[PDB]
């Protein structure tokens, strides 16, 4: 009984170890956009077309 | 000889508009003040092309 009540509680305990990587990581997916764009950005910028003012 | 001197330094007075005003979008192009520019033409840093017009 006290190791199936804890087996109950460790399939609780490892879903909120789940949890807080998926949060985690999804969080860190709109970082992957961000740094992505900003290559856009900075690829875009090192041309010689553009002024100083672009 | 006069009367086509006239048309000659004309005509020498517009090649030199030709330079100063030609631009591109504010960039001027052949009055030398472009100099050499890179354009990226690649998916990571450091793939440009050096363009020269003097």
Known sequence: ?54 | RRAIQEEVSALNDELNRIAETTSFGGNKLLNGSFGSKSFQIGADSGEAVMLSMG
């Open chain 1, 1 to 54: 009984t006290s190791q199936s009540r804890g087996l109950d509680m460790a399939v609780k305990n490892a879903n909120d170890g789940i949890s807080i990587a998926q949060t985690a990581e999804g969080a860190m997916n709109e970082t992957t956009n961000i740094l992505q764009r900003m290559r856009d950005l900075a690829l875009q910028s090192s041309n010689g077309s553009n002024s100083s003012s672009e």
